[PDB]
Amino acid sequence: LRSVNSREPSQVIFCNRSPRVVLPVWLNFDGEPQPYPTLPPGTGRRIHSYRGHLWLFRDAGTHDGLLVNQTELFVPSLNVDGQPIFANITLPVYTLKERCLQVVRSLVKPENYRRLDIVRSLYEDLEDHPNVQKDLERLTQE
Amino acid sequence: MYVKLISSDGHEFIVKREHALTSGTIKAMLSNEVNFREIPSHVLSKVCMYFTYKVRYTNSSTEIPEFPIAPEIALELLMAANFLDC
Amino acid sequence: MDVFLMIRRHKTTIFTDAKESSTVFELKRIVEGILKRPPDEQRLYKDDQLLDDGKTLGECGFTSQTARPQAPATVGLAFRADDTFEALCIEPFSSPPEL
Ligand SMILES: Cc1cc(CC(=O)N2C[C@H](O)C[C@H]2C(=O)NCc2ccc(-c3cnco3)cc2)on1
């Protein structure tokens, strides 16, 4: 799951249509996620990248998954035929459960999450942070 | 068209089947009414809200906004969430 | 615009959406289908103020920023026909614990 090493510069632009600080993530020629500087919500930026490179977006504070042009993964396309390629970054409809872990994650130090009377099985779901390395291992199947 | 979902504190929530069948749990208790012995109303209202906020916004450009969860309600919501599978 | 309401009365809450342009009275019909009571037997309120069947939701102050699917506005509902209307009454919601 790598970017193809073209050297065909492609001008993209990351519009952040989300309440969250988004962290753009370029996935390397080898596979490893590299992170760029983040985007305050609303906020756009012009970006130089390359055809067939791969990106993905998430909360810079709680690695949650956002979408880019409605899919999971961004590949910059034909840099011209008009010029910049448009990268719109969105909340999905999180499920109510994941959302519910979010607020709780954001409300309690995960040291002190064992004193929160709910089924053990929900303690495990909650200590289970979203991870890019995970999600990659996830996405990598389809 | 519509289905009722009965809180454990009496309260009744008429919602559309289409919005309802979002809970894989509820898809099966229907198939009409559903009592919930252990979900108070202050929860079932947010749930119903989620079904409308889910049914509205999925499959769409129109910048999806944040579903807001009030702290007081988080745990109890979390537990209905998991039970209702959604 | 679609507007998203929570039509409340006693221990009863209907969640429905409706156009902004549509009318108090059209909403009154939608109630007919559900609780089977004809528009004559029902009055409809927002926040005490008593609503008029000929006025648009938009104009009663229901907008796409008043009533967001995620936080839908409430509409009071009260019954019994010309033969004396019951007062406006809505049991509040179960209270949240600790923190
Ligand atoms: C050949 C070649 C070289 C490279 C490494 C590289 O220059 N990259 C990798 C990704 O395409 C990003 C691109 C890059 O470094 N672009 C410059 C850049 C700097 C800052 C940002 C930036 C700022 N805020 C968010 O992103 C975006 C692009 O990729 N192919």
PDB file of N, CA, C and O in Angstrom, chain A residues 51-124:
ATOM      1  N   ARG A  51       0.834  12.745  -8.869  1.00  0.00           N
ATOM      2  CA  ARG A  51      -0.115  11.718  -9.315  1.00  0.00           C
ATOM      3  C   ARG A  51       0.131  10.380  -8.601  1.00  0.00           C
ATOM      4  O   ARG A  51       1.253  10.038  -8.224  1.00  0.00           O
ATOM      5  N   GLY A  52      -0.950   9.660  -8.357  1.00  0.00           N
ATOM      6  CA  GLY A  52      -0.884   8.351  -7.738  1.00  0.00           C
ATOM      7  C   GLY A  52      -0.235   8.231  -6.373  1.00  0.00           C
ATOM      8  O   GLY A  52       0.085   7.124  -5.962  1.00  0.00           O
ATOM      9  N   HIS A  53      -0.009   9.349  -5.674  1.00  0.00           N
ATOM     10  CA  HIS A  53       0.385   9.299  -4.247  1.00  0.00           C
ATOM     11  C   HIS A  53      -0.862   9.093  -3.400  1.00  0.00           C
ATOM     12  O   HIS A  53      -1.973   9.315  -3.897  1.00  0.00           O
ATOM     13  N   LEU A  54      -0.706   8.688  -2.140  1.00  0.00           N
ATOM     14  CA  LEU A  54      -1.894   8.345  -1.343  1.00  0.00           C
ATOM     15  C   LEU A  54      -1.961   9.090  -0.025  1.00  0.00           C
ATOM     16  O   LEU A  54      -0.994   9.088   0.745  1.00  0.00           O
ATOM     17  N   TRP A  55      -3.113   9.691   0.255  1.00  0.00           N
ATOM     18  CA  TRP A  55      -3.287  10.402   1.520  1.00  0.00           C
ATOM     19  C   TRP A  55      -4.421   9.888   2.399  1.00  0.00           C
ATOM     20  O   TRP A  55      -5.202   9.062   2.008  1.00  0.00           O
ATOM     21  N   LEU A  56      -4.514  10.390   3.601  1.00  0.00           N
ATOM     22  CA  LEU A  56      -5.653  10.080   4.404  1.00  0.00           C
ATOM     23  C   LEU A  56      -5.696  11.031   5.599  1.00  0.00           C
ATOM     24  O   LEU A  56      -4.682  11.613   5.983  1.00  0.00           O
ATOM     25  N   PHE A  57      -6.874  11.234   6.169  1.00  0.00           N
ATOM     26  CA  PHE A  57      -7.034  12.374   7.051  1.00  0.00           C
ATOM     27  C   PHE A  57      -7.620  11.955   8.327  1.00  0.00           C
ATOM     28  O   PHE A  57      -8.344  10.954   8.375  1.00  0.00           O
ATOM     29  N   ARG A  58      -7.207  12.661   9.374  1.00  0.00           N
ATOM     30  CA  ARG A  58      -7.775  12.437  10.666  1.00  0.00           C
ATOM     31  C   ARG A  58      -7.554  13.504  11.744  1.00  0.00           C
ATOM     32  O   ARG A  58      -6.701  14.402  11.598  1.00  0.00           O
ATOM     33  N   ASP A  59      -8.358  13.412  12.807  1.00  0.00           N
ATOM     34  CA  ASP A  59      -8.267  14.322  13.925  1.00  0.00           C
ATOM     35  C   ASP A  59      -6.824  14.323  14.422  1.00  0.00           C
ATOM     36  O   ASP A  59      -6.286  13.294  14.788  1.00  0.00           O
ATOM     37  N   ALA A  60      -6.179  15.473  14.422  1.00  0.00           N
ATOM     38  CA  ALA A  60      -4.810  15.550  14.915  1.00  0.00           C
ATOM     39  C   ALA A  60      -4.666  15.315  16.411  1.00  0.00           C
ATOM     40  O   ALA A  60      -3.529  15.303  16.903  1.00  0.00           O
ATOM     41  N   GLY A  61      -5.776  15.125  17.126  1.00  0.00           N
ATOM     42  CA  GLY A  61      -5.747  14.960  18.591  1.00  0.00           C
ATOM     43  C   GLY A  61      -6.229  13.618  19.148  1.00  0.00           C
ATOM     44  O   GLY A  61      -6.002  13.310  20.324  1.00  0.00           O
ATOM     45  N   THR A  62      -6.895  12.824  18.307  1.00  0.00           N
ATOM     46  CA  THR A  62      -7.559  11.596  18.731  1.00  0.00           C
ATOM     47  C   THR A  62      -7.638  10.663  17.532  1.00  0.00           C
ATOM     48  O   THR A  62      -8.621   9.951  17.364  1.00  0.00           O
ATOM     49  N   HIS A  63      -6.624  10.710  16.674  1.00  0.00           N
ATOM     50  CA  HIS A  63      -6.550   9.953  15.378  1.00  0.00           C
ATOM     51  C   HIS A  63      -7.835   9.371  14.646  1.00  0.00           C
ATOM     52  O   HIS A  63      -7.703   8.515  13.714  1.00  0.00           O
ATOM     53  N   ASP A  64      -9.034   9.859  15.032  1.00  0.00           N
ATOM     54  CA  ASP A  64     -10.345   9.446  14.446  1.00  0.00           C
ATOM     55  C   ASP A  64     -10.362   9.507  12.900  1.00  0.00           C
ATOM     56  O   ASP A  64      -9.656  10.298  12.313  1.00  0.00           O
ATOM     57  N   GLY A  65     -11.182   8.713  12.230  1.00  0.00           N
ATOM     58  CA  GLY A  65     -11.147   8.716  10.765  1.00  0.00           C
ATOM     59  C   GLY A  65     -12.092   9.687  10.064  1.00  0.00           C
ATOM     60  O   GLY A  65     -13.333   9.629  10.263  1.00  0.00           O
ATOM     61  N   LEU A  66     -11.522  10.562   9.235  1.00  0.00           N
ATOM     62  CA  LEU A  66     -12.307  11.447   8.416  1.00  0.00           C
ATOM     63  C   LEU A  66     -12.365  10.923   6.969  1.00  0.00           C
ATOM     64  O   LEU A  66     -11.664   9.996   6.641  1.00  0.00           O
ATOM     65  N   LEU A  67     -13.232  11.475   6.116  1.00  0.00           N
ATOM     66  CA  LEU A  67     -13.237  11.099   4.702  1.00  0.00           C
ATOM     67  C   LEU A  67     -12.597  12.156   3.801  1.00  0.00           C
ATOM     68  O   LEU A  67     -12.444  13.299   4.187  1.00  0.00           O
ATOM     69  N   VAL A  68     -12.187  11.774   2.606  1.00  0.00           N
ATOM     70  CA  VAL A  68     -11.698  12.760   1.674  1.00  0.00           C
ATOM     71  C   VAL A  68     -12.382  12.407   0.354  1.00  0.00           C
ATOM     72  O   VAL A  68     -12.344  11.256  -0.094  1.00  0.00           O
ATOM     73  N   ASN A  69     -13.077  13.380  -0.228  1.00  0.00           N
ATOM     74  CA  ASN A  69     -13.932  13.123  -1.373  1.00  0.00           C
ATOM     75  C   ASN A  69     -14.695  11.821  -1.213  1.00  0.00           C
ATOM     76  O   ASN A  69     -14.770  10.971  -2.121  1.00  0.00           O
ATOM     77  N   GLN A  70     -15.253  11.694  -0.007  1.00  0.00           N
ATOM     78  CA  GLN A  70     -16.285  10.722   0.292  1.00  0.00           C
ATOM     79  C   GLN A  70     -15.739   9.330   0.447  1.00  0.00           C
ATOM     80  O   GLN A  70     -16.434   8.459   0.958  1.00  0.00           O
ATOM     81  N   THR A  71     -14.509   9.100   0.002  1.00  0.00           N
ATOM     82  CA  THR A  71     -13.883   7.805   0.237  1.00  0.00           C
ATOM     83  C   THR A  71     -12.898   7.863   1.410  1.00  0.00           C
ATOM     84  O   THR A  71     -12.655   8.947   2.015  1.00  0.00           O
ATOM     85  N   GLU A  72     -12.339   6.688   1.718  1.00  0.00           N
ATOM     86  CA  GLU A  72     -11.317   6.572   2.751  1.00  0.00           C
ATOM     87  C   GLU A  72      -9.972   7.215   2.369  1.00  0.00           C
ATOM     88  O   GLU A  72      -9.299   7.748   3.254  1.00  0.00           O
ATOM     89  N   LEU A  73      -9.612   7.182   1.068  1.00  0.00           N
ATOM     90  CA  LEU A  73      -8.235   7.443   0.592  1.00  0.00           C
ATOM     91  C   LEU A  73      -8.086   8.322  -0.644  1.00  0.00           C
ATOM     92  O   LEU A  73      -8.677   8.037  -1.703  1.00  0.00           O
ATOM     93  N   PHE A  74      -7.227   9.336  -0.519  1.00  0.00           N
ATOM     94  CA  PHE A  74      -6.978  10.330  -1.570  1.00  0.00           C
ATOM     95  C   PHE A  74      -5.765  10.060  -2.492  1.00  0.00           C
ATOM     96  O   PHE A  74      -4.602   9.968  -2.055  1.00  0.00           O
ATOM     97  N   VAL A  75      -6.063   9.952  -3.779  1.00  0.00           N
ATOM     98  CA  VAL A  75      -5.041   9.895  -4.797  1.00  0.00           C
ATOM     99  C   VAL A  75      -5.218  11.109  -5.685  1.00  0.00           C
ATOM    100  O   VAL A  75      -6.200  11.159  -6.426  1.00  0.00           O
ATOM    101  N   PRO A  76      -4.274  12.084  -5.609  1.00  0.00           N
ATOM    102  CA  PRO A  76      -4.218  13.211  -6.526  1.00  0.00           C
ATOM    103  C   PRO A  76      -4.260  12.761  -7.997  1.00  0.00           C
ATOM    104  O   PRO A  76      -3.574  11.801  -8.391  1.00  0.00           O
ATOM    105  N   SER A  77      -5.074  13.460  -8.782  1.00  0.00           N
ATOM    106  CA  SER A  77      -5.241  13.157 -10.192  1.00  0.00           C
ATOM    107  C   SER A  77      -4.681  14.256 -11.098  1.00  0.00           C
ATOM    108  O   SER A  77      -4.195  15.307 -10.622  1.00  0.00           O
ATOM    109  N   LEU A  78      -4.782  13.985 -12.406  1.00  0.00           N
ATOM    110  CA  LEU A  78      -4.192  14.789 -13.491  1.00  0.00           C
ATOM    111  C   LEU A  78      -4.075  16.294 -13.199  1.00  0.00           C
ATOM    112  O   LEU A  78      -5.018  17.051 -13.435  1.00  0.00           O
ATOM    113  N   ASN A  79      -2.891  16.700 -12.718  1.00  0.00           N
ATOM    114  CA  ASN A  79      -2.629  18.019 -12.089  1.00  0.00           C
ATOM    115  C   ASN A  79      -3.149  19.222 -12.830  1.00  0.00           C
ATOM    116  O   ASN A  79      -3.328  20.267 -12.223  1.00  0.00           O
ATOM    117  N   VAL A  80      -3.323  19.058 -14.146  1.00  0.00           N
ATOM    118  CA  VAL A  80      -3.847  20.085 -15.056  1.00  0.00           C
ATOM    119  C   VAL A  80      -5.222  19.616 -15.530  1.00  0.00           C
ATOM    120  O   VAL A  80      -5.984  19.052 -14.746  1.00  0.00           O
ATOM    121  N   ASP A  81      -5.537  19.830 -16.804  1.00  0.00           N
ATOM    122  CA  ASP A  81      -6.916  19.700 -17.253  1.00  0.00           C
ATOM    123  C   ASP A  81      -7.762  20.628 -16.363  1.00  0.00           C
ATOM    124  O   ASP A  81      -8.878  20.268 -15.946  1.00  0.00           O
ATOM    125  N   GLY A  82      -7.206  21.809 -16.061  1.00  0.00           N
ATOM    126  CA  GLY A  82      -7.875  22.805 -15.209  1.00  0.00           C
ATOM    127  C   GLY A  82      -7.032  23.407 -14.085  1.00  0.00           C
ATOM    128  O   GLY A  82      -7.092  24.620 -13.849  1.00  0.00           O
ATOM    129  N   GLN A  83      -6.305  22.540 -13.373  1.00  0.00           N
ATOM    130  CA  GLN A  83      -5.272  22.873 -12.369  1.00  0.00           C
ATOM    131  C   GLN A  83      -5.447  22.154 -11.013  1.00  0.00           C
ATOM    132  O   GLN A  83      -5.071  20.973 -10.920  1.00  0.00           O
ATOM    133  N   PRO A  84      -6.001  22.818  -9.967  1.00  0.00           N
ATOM    134  CA  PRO A  84      -5.820  22.166  -8.656  1.00  0.00           C
ATOM    135  C   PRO A  84      -6.829  21.055  -8.378  1.00  0.00           C
ATOM    136  O   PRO A  84      -7.957  21.140  -8.835  1.00  0.00           O
ATOM    137  N   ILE A  85      -6.433  20.012  -7.651  1.00  0.00           N
ATOM    138  CA  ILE A  85      -7.401  18.960  -7.275  1.00  0.00           C
ATOM    139  C   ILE A  85      -7.952  19.163  -5.858  1.00  0.00           C
ATOM    140  O   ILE A  85      -7.211  19.491  -4.907  1.00  0.00           O
ATOM    141  N   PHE A  86      -9.263  18.974  -5.741  1.00  0.00           N
ATOM    142  CA  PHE A  86      -9.990  19.410  -4.566  1.00  0.00           C
ATOM    143  C   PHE A  86     -10.192  18.330  -3.528  1.00  0.00           C
ATOM    144  O   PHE A  86     -10.920  17.368  -3.774  1.00  0.00           O
ATOM    145  N   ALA A  87      -9.557  18.516  -2.366  1.00  0.00           N
ATOM    146  CA  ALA A  87      -9.615  17.562  -1.242  1.00  0.00           C
ATOM    147  C   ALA A  87     -10.471  18.055  -0.050  1.00  0.00           C
ATOM    148  O   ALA A  87     -10.004  18.832   0.815  1.00  0.00           O
ATOM    149  N   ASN A  88     -11.726  17.594  -0.027  1.00  0.00           N
ATOM    150  CA  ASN A  88     -12.713  18.014   0.978  1.00  0.00           C
ATOM    151  C   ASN A  88     -12.755  16.993   2.103  1.00  0.00           C
ATOM    152  O   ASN A  88     -12.902  15.794   1.852  1.00  0.00           O
ATOM    153  N   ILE A  89     -12.618  17.470   3.335  1.00  0.00           N
ATOM    154  CA  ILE A  89     -12.386  16.590   4.479  1.00  0.00           C
ATOM    155  C   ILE A  89     -13.539  16.611   5.502  1.00  0.00           C
ATOM    156  O   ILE A  89     -13.839  17.647   6.119  1.00  0.00           O
ATOM    157  N   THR A  90     -14.175  15.462   5.696  1.00  0.00           N
ATOM    158  CA  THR A  90     -15.451  15.416   6.433  1.00  0.00           C
ATOM    159  C   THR A  90     -15.584  14.387   7.600  1.00  0.00           C
ATOM    160  O   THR A  90     -14.945  13.318   7.621  1.00  0.00           O
ATOM    161  N   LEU A  91     -16.437  14.729   8.564  1.00  0.00           N
ATOM    162  CA  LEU A  91     -16.896  13.760   9.529  1.00  0.00           C
ATOM    163  C   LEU A  91     -17.668  12.741   8.735  1.00  0.00           C
ATOM    164  O   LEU A  91     -18.436  13.108   7.838  1.00  0.00           O
ATOM    165  N   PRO A  92     -17.470  11.451   9.035  1.00  0.00           N
ATOM    166  CA  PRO A  92     -18.546  10.591   8.578  1.00  0.00           C
ATOM    167  C   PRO A  92     -19.716  10.685   9.566  1.00  0.00           C
ATOM    168  O   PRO A  92     -19.647  11.381  10.596  1.00  0.00           O
ATOM    169  N   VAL A  93     -20.810  10.028   9.236  1.00  0.00           N
ATOM    170  CA  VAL A  93     -21.716   9.664  10.288  1.00  0.00           C
ATOM    171  C   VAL A  93     -20.977   8.576  11.095  1.00  0.00           C
ATOM    172  O   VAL A  93     -21.026   7.390  10.758  1.00  0.00           O
ATOM    173  N   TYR A  94     -20.238   8.983  12.120  1.00  0.00           N
ATOM    174  CA  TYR A  94     -19.715   7.988  13.047  1.00  0.00           C
ATOM    175  C   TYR A  94     -20.938   7.202  13.451  1.00  0.00           C
ATOM    176  O   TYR A  94     -22.062   7.729  13.339  1.00  0.00           O
ATOM    177  N   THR A  95     -20.763   5.953  13.878  1.00  0.00           N
ATOM    178  CA  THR A  95     -21.887   5.259  14.495  1.00  0.00           C
ATOM    179  C   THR A  95     -22.083   5.895  15.862  1.00  0.00           C
ATOM    180  O   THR A  95     -21.262   6.689  16.304  1.00  0.00           O
ATOM    181  N   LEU A  96     -23.179   5.565  16.521  1.00  0.00           N
ATOM    182  CA  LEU A  96     -23.454   6.164  17.792  1.00  0.00           C
ATOM    183  C   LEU A  96     -22.480   5.581  18.784  1.00  0.00           C
ATOM    184  O   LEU A  96     -22.122   6.261  19.766  1.00  0.00           O
ATOM    185  N   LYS A  97     -22.021   4.353  18.534  1.00  0.00           N
ATOM    186  CA  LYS A  97     -21.137   3.749  19.525  1.00  0.00           C
ATOM    187  C   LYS A  97     -19.770   4.397  19.495  1.00  0.00           C
ATOM    188  O   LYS A  97     -19.286   4.841  20.554  1.00  0.00           O
ATOM    189  N   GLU A  98     -19.169   4.497  18.300  1.00  0.00           N
ATOM    190  CA  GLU A  98     -17.825   5.073  18.222  1.00  0.00           C
ATOM    191  C   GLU A  98     -17.870   6.493  18.747  1.00  0.00           C
ATOM    192  O   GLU A  98     -17.111   6.832  19.677  1.00  0.00           O
ATOM    193  N   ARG A  99     -18.799   7.295  18.219  1.00  0.00           N
ATOM    194  CA  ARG A  99     -19.040   8.609  18.767  1.00  0.00           C
ATOM    195  C   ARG A  99     -19.071   8.532  20.274  1.00  0.00           C
ATOM    196  O   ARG A  99     -18.428   9.338  20.946  1.00  0.00           O
ATOM    197  N   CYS A 100     -19.796   7.565  20.825  1.00  0.00           N
ATOM    198  CA  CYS A 100     -19.888   7.508  22.269  1.00  0.00           C
ATOM    199  C   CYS A 100     -18.557   7.193  22.958  1.00  0.00           C
ATOM    200  O   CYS A 100     -18.258   7.722  24.056  1.00  0.00           O
ATOM    201  N   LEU A 101     -17.731   6.360  22.335  1.00  0.00           N
ATOM    202  CA  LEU A 101     -16.390   6.228  22.895  1.00  0.00           C
ATOM    203  C   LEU A 101     -15.645   7.611  22.843  1.00  0.00           C
ATOM    204  O   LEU A 101     -15.229   8.165  23.872  1.00  0.00           O
ATOM    205  N   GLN A 102     -15.583   8.217  21.667  1.00  0.00           N
ATOM    206  CA  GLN A 102     -15.046   9.598  21.552  1.00  0.00           C
ATOM    207  C   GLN A 102     -15.266  10.562  22.749  1.00  0.00           C
ATOM    208  O   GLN A 102     -14.270  11.010  23.351  1.00  0.00           O
ATOM    209  N   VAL A 103     -16.533  10.863  23.083  1.00  0.00           N
ATOM    210  CA  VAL A 103     -16.858  11.815  24.166  1.00  0.00           C
ATOM    211  C   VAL A 103     -16.257  11.346  25.471  1.00  0.00           C
ATOM    212  O   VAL A 103     -15.621  12.126  26.183  1.00  0.00           O
ATOM    213  N   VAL A 104     -16.456  10.063  25.769  1.00  0.00           N
ATOM    214  CA  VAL A 104     -15.823   9.448  26.943  1.00  0.00           C
ATOM    215  C   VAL A 104     -14.285   9.463  26.842  1.00  0.00           C
ATOM    216  O   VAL A 104     -13.604   9.910  27.765  1.00  0.00           O
ATOM    217  N   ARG A 105     -13.724   9.038  25.720  1.00  0.00           N
ATOM    218  CA  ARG A 105     -12.267   9.184  25.599  1.00  0.00           C
ATOM    219  C   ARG A 105     -11.822  10.591  25.968  1.00  0.00           C
ATOM    220  O   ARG A 105     -10.925  10.755  26.789  1.00  0.00           O
ATOM    221  N   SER A 106     -12.508  11.578  25.395  1.00  0.00           N
ATOM    222  CA  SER A 106     -12.228  12.989  25.585  1.00  0.00           C
ATOM    223  C   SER A 106     -12.579  13.496  26.960  1.00  0.00           C
ATOM    224  O   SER A 106     -12.285  14.644  27.276  1.00  0.00           O
ATOM    225  N   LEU A 107     -13.258  12.679  27.763  1.00  0.00           N
ATOM    226  CA  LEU A 107     -13.733  13.164  29.065  1.00  0.00           C
ATOM    227  C   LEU A 107     -12.978  12.559  30.254  1.00  0.00           C
ATOM    228  O   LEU A 107     -12.984  13.130  31.348  1.00  0.00           O
ATOM    229  N   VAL A 108     -12.310  11.425  30.015  1.00  0.00           N
ATOM    230  CA  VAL A 108     -11.578  10.671  31.059  1.00  0.00           C
ATOM    231  C   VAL A 108     -10.172  10.193  30.657  1.00  0.00           C
ATOM    232  O   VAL A 108      -9.994   9.549  29.605  1.00  0.00           O
ATOM    233  N   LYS A 109      -9.194  10.507  31.513  1.00  0.00           N
ATOM    234  CA  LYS A 109      -7.864   9.909  31.478  1.00  0.00           C
ATOM    235  C   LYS A 109      -7.947   8.359  31.488  1.00  0.00           C
ATOM    236  O   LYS A 109      -8.525   7.761  32.410  1.00  0.00           O
ATOM    237  N   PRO A 110      -7.352   7.708  30.459  1.00  0.00           N
ATOM    238  CA  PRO A 110      -7.532   6.276  30.251  1.00  0.00           C
ATOM    239  C   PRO A 110      -6.693   5.469  31.224  1.00  0.00           C
ATOM    240  O   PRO A 110      -6.759   4.221  31.219  1.00  0.00           O
ATOM    241  N   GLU A 111      -5.908   6.174  32.049  1.00  0.00           N
ATOM    242  CA  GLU A 111      -5.446   5.592  33.309  1.00  0.00           C
ATOM    243  C   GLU A 111      -6.717   5.315  34.105  1.00  0.00           C
ATOM    244  O   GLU A 111      -7.079   4.156  34.296  1.00  0.00           O
ATOM    245  N   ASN A 112      -7.439   6.377  34.470  1.00  0.00           N
ATOM    246  CA  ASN A 112      -8.609   6.294  35.366  1.00  0.00           C
ATOM    247  C   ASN A 112      -9.935   5.814  34.748  1.00  0.00           C
ATOM    248  O   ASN A 112     -10.985   6.282  35.181  1.00  0.00           O
ATOM    249  N   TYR A 113      -9.903   4.882  33.780  1.00  0.00           N
ATOM    250  CA  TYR A 113     -11.131   4.339  33.107  1.00  0.00           C
ATOM    251  C   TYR A 113     -11.662   2.974  33.631  1.00  0.00           C
ATOM    252  O   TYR A 113     -12.393   2.277  32.947  1.00  0.00           O
ATOM    253  N   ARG A 114     -11.283   2.597  34.840  1.00  0.00           N
ATOM    254  CA  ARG A 114     -11.576   1.264  35.384  1.00  0.00           C
ATOM    255  C   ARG A 114     -12.550   1.445  36.534  1.00  0.00           C
ATOM    256  O   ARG A 114     -13.037   0.468  37.138  1.00  0.00           O
ATOM    257  N   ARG A 115     -12.796   2.726  36.819  1.00  0.00           N
ATOM    258  CA  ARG A 115     -13.632   3.192  37.902  1.00  0.00           C
ATOM    259  C   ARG A 115     -14.885   3.822  37.312  1.00  0.00           C
ATOM    260  O   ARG A 115     -15.421   4.781  37.874  1.00  0.00           O
ATOM    261  N   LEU A 116     -15.336   3.283  36.175  1.00  0.00           N
ATOM    262  CA  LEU A 116     -16.424   3.872  35.375  1.00  0.00           C
ATOM    263  C   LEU A 116     -17.460   2.802  35.107  1.00  0.00           C
ATOM    264  O   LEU A 116     -17.483   2.216  34.023  1.00  0.00           O
ATOM    265  N   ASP A 117     -18.323   2.572  36.093  1.00  0.00           N
ATOM    266  CA  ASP A 117     -19.180   1.386  36.116  1.00  0.00           C
ATOM    267  C   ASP A 117     -19.926   1.114  34.817  1.00  0.00           C
ATOM    268  O   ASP A 117     -20.972   1.716  34.557  1.00  0.00           O
ATOM    269  N   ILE A 118     -19.355   0.208  34.025  1.00  0.00           N
ATOM    270  CA  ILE A 118     -19.946  -0.350  32.808  1.00  0.00           C
ATOM    271  C   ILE A 118     -19.225  -1.662  32.515  1.00  0.00           C
ATOM    272  O   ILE A 118     -18.036  -1.799  32.821  1.00  0.00           O
ATOM    273  N   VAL A 119     -19.938  -2.617  31.919  1.00  0.00           N
ATOM    274  CA  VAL A 119     -19.378  -3.920  31.500  1.00  0.00           C
ATOM    275  C   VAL A 119     -17.897  -3.866  31.055  1.00  0.00           C
ATOM    276  O   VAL A 119     -17.563  -3.108  30.155  1.00  0.00           O
ATOM    277  N   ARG A 120     -17.034  -4.675  31.678  1.00  0.00           N
ATOM    278  CA  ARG A 120     -15.638  -4.894  31.232  1.00  0.00           C
ATOM    279  C   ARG A 120     -15.411  -4.841  29.703  1.00  0.00           C
ATOM    280  O   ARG A 120     -14.462  -4.204  29.229  1.00  0.00           O
ATOM    281  N   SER A 121     -16.267  -5.527  28.944  1.00  0.00           N
ATOM    282  CA  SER A 121     -16.213  -5.505  27.479  1.00  0.00           C
ATOM    283  C   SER A 121     -16.243  -4.117  26.834  1.00  0.00           C
ATOM    284  O   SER A 121     -15.827  -3.966  25.685  1.00  0.00           O
ATOM    285  N   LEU A 122     -16.793  -3.133  27.545  1.00  0.00           N
ATOM    286  CA  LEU A 122     -16.823  -1.756  27.075  1.00  0.00           C
ATOM    287  C   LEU A 122     -15.613  -0.998  27.547  1.00  0.00           C
ATOM    288  O   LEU A 122     -15.277   0.035  26.967  1.00  0.00           O
ATOM    289  N   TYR A 123     -14.951  -1.509  28.590  1.00  0.00           N
ATOM    290  CA  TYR A 123     -13.639  -0.986  28.996  1.00  0.00           C
ATOM    291  C   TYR A 123     -12.606  -1.329  27.901  1.00  0.00           C
ATOM    292  O   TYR A 123     -11.734  -0.535  27.582  1.00  0.00           O
ATOM    293  N   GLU A 124     -12.753  -2.492  27.288  1.00  0.00           N
ATOM    294  CA  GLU A 124     -11.803  -2.930  26.281  1.00  0.00           C
ATOM    295  C   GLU A 124     -11.964  -2.183  24.962  1.00  0.00           C
ATOM    296  O   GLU A 124     -10.973  -1.942  24.253  1.00  0.00           O
TER     297      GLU A 124
END
